[PDB]
Structure 1
Amino acid sequence: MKRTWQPNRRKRAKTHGFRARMRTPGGRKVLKRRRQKGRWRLTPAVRK
């Protein structure tokens, strides 16, 4: 049956991407947090 993950590169980049996070206070905190934690990827990898 049709499941929940329906990958879509535009939707992905436009919702979780770097420029999407950077435009809002909540989004920058995500990046400040994930940089402070030392994550290798601040944002989901999208093929583009």
Structure 2
Amino acid sequence: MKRTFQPSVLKRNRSHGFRARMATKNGRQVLARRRAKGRARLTVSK
């Protein structure tokens, strides 16, 4: 009902957790594609 998009830092850890996305092999491949091989940046690291 409370629909939807909003920002927070503490909900991140089990899903959008940046170092958790390096710890899982699931995440790791995608990160490297998205900015190591694929020309690009992320930088939203605060």
Q: Quickly name the TM-score band, shorter chain normalised.
A: 0.5 to 0.7
Which runs of 5 or more structure 2 residues have no equivalent in the other structure?
none
More helix by share: 1
Q: Identity over aligned residues, as a percent?
A: 52
How many residues are matched?
44
Which runs of 5 or more structure 1 residues have no equivalent in the other structure?
none
Ranked by relative contact order (alpha carbons within 8 Å, sequence separation 6 or more), the top structure is 1
Contact 1:21 1:28 in 2 (8 A): yes
Aligned positions of 1:1-48 closer than 5 A: 2-12=2-12, 14=13, 15-34=15-34, 35-41=36-42, 45=44, 47=46
- Structure 1 runs (4+) greater than 2 angstroms displaced: none
After TM superposition, the score normalised by the length of structure 2 is: 0.62
Amino acid across the alignment from 1:9: V
